[PDB]
Design a protein around this ligand. Sequence first.
Ligand SMILES: CCCCCCCCCCCCCCCCCC(=O)OC[C@H](COP(=O)(O)O)OC(=O)CCCCCCCCCCCCCCCCC
Ligand SMILES: CCCCCCCCCCCCCCCCCC(=O)OC[C@H](COP(=O)(O)O)OC(=O)CCCCCCCCCCCCCCCCC
Lengths: 385, 385
Amino acid sequence: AWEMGVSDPRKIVFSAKIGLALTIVALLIFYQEPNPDLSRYSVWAILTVVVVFEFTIGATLSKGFNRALGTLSAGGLALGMAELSTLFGDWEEIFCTLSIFCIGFLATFMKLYPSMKAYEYGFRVFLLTYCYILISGFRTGQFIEVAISRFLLIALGAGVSLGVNMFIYPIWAGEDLHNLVVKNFMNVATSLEGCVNGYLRCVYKGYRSAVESTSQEESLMSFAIWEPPHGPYKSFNYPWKNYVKLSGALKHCAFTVMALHGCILSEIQAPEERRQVFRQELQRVGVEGAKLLRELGEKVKKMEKLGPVDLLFEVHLAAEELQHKIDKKSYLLVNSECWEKTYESASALSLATFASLLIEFVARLQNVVDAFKELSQKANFKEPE
Amino acid sequence: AWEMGVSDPRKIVFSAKIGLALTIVALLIFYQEPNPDLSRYSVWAILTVVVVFEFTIGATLSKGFNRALGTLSAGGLALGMAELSTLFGDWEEIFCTLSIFCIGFLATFMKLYPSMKAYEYGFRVFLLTYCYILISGFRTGQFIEVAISRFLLIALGAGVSLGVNMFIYPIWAGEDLHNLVVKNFMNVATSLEGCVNGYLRCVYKGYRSAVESTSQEESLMSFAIWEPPHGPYKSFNYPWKNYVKLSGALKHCAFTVMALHGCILSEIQAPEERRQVFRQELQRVGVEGAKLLRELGEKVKKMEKLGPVDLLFEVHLAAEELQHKIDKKSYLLVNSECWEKTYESASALSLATFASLLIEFVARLQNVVDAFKELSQKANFKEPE
Ligand SMILES: CCCCCCCCCCCCCCCCCC(=O)OC[C@H](COP(=O)(O)O)OC(=O)CCCCCCCCCCCCCCCCC
Ligand SMILES: CCCCCCCCCCCCCCCCCC(=O)OC[C@H](COP(=O)(O)O)OC(=O)CCCCCCCCCCCCCCCCC
């Protein structure tokens, strides 16, 4: 509660913005000139604020659009069917009650398609609008006055919501993706260092977050394409997809780290005294990889191009040194006596897996640099100082 | 569309059941004795069917419970505050418009807690009920008639929804979890066989589904605890958690399978001519593991206890034979000349990783059998024939 508000102050301004919009609409409802029709249909404006106010501007824009589509299509269809119902003079209510079944069936069958799982809020508004207009106009045969009035109030509630959301400390969806990429770049480095230290001792959250947030990075990219130019990102078409490409290149590397963490939990493990022979090349490889990942993160955050010096030189030097050390001492990995128990053979052969995995991680590091260069070229990044 | 309906007929009965419930409520609204108050508040019953009809009975019960709690708490609070408002005779509307701000702030701050992410439908109904009751009773000063009437029509809509859902081909939430476990047991076997065949050639969906559905298996377990006894699962407290325990034991193996798939995508690979020397042992291990996983799946599906014969004898024997074959030919994994290029050394050392991973998979297979025995003991499984 209070501890969470003090930890993050971005969650105490959104609630007060919603309270302010609600108080404004309420003041306009209480302090208005009395009239017969408004009196009974005036609560339709304070209930739209509670249904259209979202955390970011892009979603607010993207979802309000779908809801409006659902509403206008349902209203037009309902009005057309209500007009057509007259022809069957003898059985008006039979046809009207036979149209609800066919529309509920079609609207429930079209929302179970696997590609429409994220759009159920647009099918619910369609069913609600269709039913309400048919069941609310049967008495007094008024179908063009029960919609034109009840739509202006919804428009006014959505206008107040959008104005308050957009002009009082806006929160943007491209600034949560630019930040998420930088956070993942540091989590992967922390996980790698923790894994190498845990293995050499006499790690989970980082790679789990960097391997499981692809959907967050696709929703934020589907919300950031609706927002107008602002701040440092001033261009009509911003290359938002290159951030997803860089994130995918980093997750491909993070799989190796997940496998190195799995190696620590394996039932079959190697004698520590044998691990302490290669104790000096794994920590150097880890330190160099973590430093490289943190330098890439820092460059991405400050939006600067890569300088001339090749950042992969020291890591490749440390990996070649690892390879040489493994080559000199390969007599500890196998047993030449049997050349032509099994638990001790597997325990011995378990160290080579860890070394080969570290080596593969290094061999993969290059794709992330290539993706970063592509991103820094598509978007005009500042020249390094 | 039609192809999906023909593929799965369970989605064509749910739609017709929602059409039947909607048509029943519509007929009961069209054909009733006219009265002043009902005429304007009678559409409140056809709109509850569209908001309370869910795929399973369990969820239907859980979500309706949480929605009723939100509605009743919001209504009681609104009525109490409306009563208290009188004291401030001079400024009634000021106090009423100043309570909306506070309630909106608290209801928006309590829904942003990380533990309440799955309950936003219960906070939206609370805010809507409070606002509607406060703003719809200011005129005429009627606060005990705007709720008692508008609640019996919601009770009638929910009663019709529950009767039609529960008595016309019900869909239960424990029969989708019992089926999901059996499907995962076969996907893991298919993935293992595909990976072992792909490596020796001159795999993804299975383990991805078996490693990413923990949330589906926890929501289905949070919906199955509300359902009454029925069919084969007849007991007051069914051991639904032992299915999740078995699923976790299988996912622990599926991690190793993911690592064996990762080995195929590695940049550094071994000459095929060297792999061909060990093909037979790897294929025997794969065949035996897949047969064991399919026998466990088949036993789980038919609810039968494990027989006397030990299922792991063959796999352990194929693994000891693998170990012996690796021991006889370890001179192909390293290079004794350098005892005291790096790409060829790494390519050579990459085969031992694959062999050690297969061995670890086998070493882990035991925990799944232990979990299965525990599950078959907690629930009364039939004696094997
Ligand atoms: C008993 C045990 C079971 C418990 C059951 C729990 C029940 C929980 C459910 C609670 C109530 C369920 C619904 C009740 C029936 C619905 C009718 C009702 O509540 O009356 C309210 C309301 C009152 O109508 P009146 O009293 O007849 O005047 O009727 C409505 O349904 C209209 C509400 C409209 C406000 C919704 C916001 C509009 C959305 C449009 C979005 C379009 C996009 C925005 C614009 C885009 C840019 C242009
Ligand atoms: C102490 C005792 C305590 C008693 C506790 C019970 C208290 C009394 C219970 C009643 C109080 C509950 C009040 C609110 C209940 C929550 C439900 C709610 O408020 O709303 C639900 C709901 C709105 O919120 P939603 O559920 O989120 O969608 O109501 C609706 O169905 C409205 C949906 C909007 C569409 C309706 C059709 C209007 C279309 C008009 C515009 C059409 C334009 C067409 C253009 C044609 C030309 C092209």
